[PDB]
Amino acid sequence: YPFWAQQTYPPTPREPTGRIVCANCHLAAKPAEVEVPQSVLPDTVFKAVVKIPYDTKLQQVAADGSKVGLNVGAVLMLPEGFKIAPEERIPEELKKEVGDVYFQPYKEGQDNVLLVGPLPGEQYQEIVFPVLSPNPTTDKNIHFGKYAIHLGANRGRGQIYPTGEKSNNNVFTASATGTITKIAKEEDEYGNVKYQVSIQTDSGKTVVDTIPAGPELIVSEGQAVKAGEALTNNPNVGGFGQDDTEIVLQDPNRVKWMIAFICLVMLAQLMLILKKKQVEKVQAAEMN
Amino acid sequence: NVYDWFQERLEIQALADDVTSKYVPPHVNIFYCLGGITLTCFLIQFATGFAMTFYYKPTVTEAYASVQYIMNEVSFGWLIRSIHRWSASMMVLMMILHVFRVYLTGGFKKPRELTWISGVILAVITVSFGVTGYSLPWDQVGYWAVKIVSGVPEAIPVVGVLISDLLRGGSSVGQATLTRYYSAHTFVLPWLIAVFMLLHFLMIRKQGISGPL
Amino acid sequence: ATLKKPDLSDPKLRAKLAKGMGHNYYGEPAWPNDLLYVFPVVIMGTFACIVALSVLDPAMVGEPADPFATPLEILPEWYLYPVFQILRSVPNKLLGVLLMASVPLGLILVPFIENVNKFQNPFRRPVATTIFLFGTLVTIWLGIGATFPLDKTLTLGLF
Amino acid sequence: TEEMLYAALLSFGLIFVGWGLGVLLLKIQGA
């Protein structure tokens, strides 16, 4: 979950390579997208659209082993000065477009980095962020210019818990090498279902690979295939994804002056061509 | 009179006579501008390039902050650097289009092959400008790009490591590399491109444009 | 339209024409028509476009260099995509280096190879033109390839 | 890959607009 990133990685979600710590547990890789305007004027509310697409009619393995759907979650890193727009500065349609999202800053005094999720994966295939741009005029620590935006989005259950132990949403493997003999499910009424798989011979050996219930099985009886043999099949159907983009915190004066200059240029060009046209006449009156 | 003053001594009229003796034939279309547009992009690089030497600091501790300083504090610095970033790409692009126009008009064939060669050299020089420039900000991309390109020559069996060690000024990438690269970007390449542009232009002005199609 | 025909009664011009020159002795006068009135338009046009691009799409400032952290998604500039695609795909490094060096060196040989033919118009030389278009296609192909992951870099995620 | 499309279509397309325009002026003056 997005908060386990805070728990396990307090200072920042992004690693110096730009990998986003989210990947340390969500080991699958599904696409993710972040869309924002190419430019924004200072002190302006705008839309930042996260996209976390996946086959809607495709379910995953639940913690107990059932077949439940999947939720989406994401971390979004915006430039310094950017933050969620005050509820009062958000218009109606946008406010409606955003939904019941609970934008959560990564830590105290880091309102530009925002965690999101878990949200329902069917309704939030895309997640709208209502963002207010900063103002270099009132904040002298902010400047106009081009800045990066980093998305880290995810859908589906992770494979590793903060404690370290694995989960029931990934493949399991053998220990060493020896004859398997058992396929049972020594389930308690206190705990849930398991699956027994033994080992023997070659060098004594009497070890058992008791694994959780949830994945499939492609192993029947009596084998010994090294250590790392895929015997459980991969039940994962989600995955983490990153996308980066750029936004220009633009100054309108900067633009309008440019426009003026361009107009001047076009004027000058025109006059030069006209002059040439004037000369074309004078030259034509001296041919023969 | 000034014209008489100059004409008495340097025969200034000799110039004007030469400029006005030149004509442009009918087969010279708009694509014949691409060469002169590649040049126009370079002059911009020279101006904006020069300007940034007044604030940029070629040290691993000073560079990144100096680029920031140009972007955030220096007047119009953002515009200068932006122009310098764009006009470089544009120079390379216009050079490629220039090459297209040259090849697809057969202007490289005899007796203009030296112009073509000097052109190729010019292209290698411009790409060198690009590569060396790319790493001056000494940000992540620049550093890791330099670290990749610097290692390529090592593949040569006899003198690869020497070449690489010359390029980075050592066995690894660091301050020496930045120094050598900055020297290369702000001293060597300008003089080289100058010389080869001079030769290019002299040969072209000597022989004139290639014929029609 | 302001036009001077070639003076074919002048041996000096014919001597140049025979040599593949003298093509700046006829046509419209270079000065003032082109140099004084049209070149400035091109200059100002270029500068104007670059300025507009610079204002609307200014330069960014990446994160500072970390020699202990190799970035994911690390590319050069576009004009090095084709070369970059070659160097990372070809297993033998020296081969790749040679292939890289083959680009400018090969180009230097073009004029001497095609001196066989005197023609300039691409239509009067379809072999060279075919090879050129092929080259261009392969170049752009490699270029795009450079952006895709190494798995689907050559196949380009198609075949 | 949206800015790229715009850039491509427009950079390729507006050339013909400028061209046609130039021709139009040429026709207007009568060369």
Partner: peptide
């Protein structure tokens, strides 16, 4: 929406340059 006008400007100079170059030299 001054930004839109901003881009339009770029487009218009790009167009107008070709236009003026063409008209200038009876272009091609």
């Amino acid at each position: 929406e001054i930004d839109v006008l901003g881009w339009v400007a770029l487009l218009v100079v790009f167009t107008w340059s070709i236009a003026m170059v063409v008209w200038g030299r009876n272009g091609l």
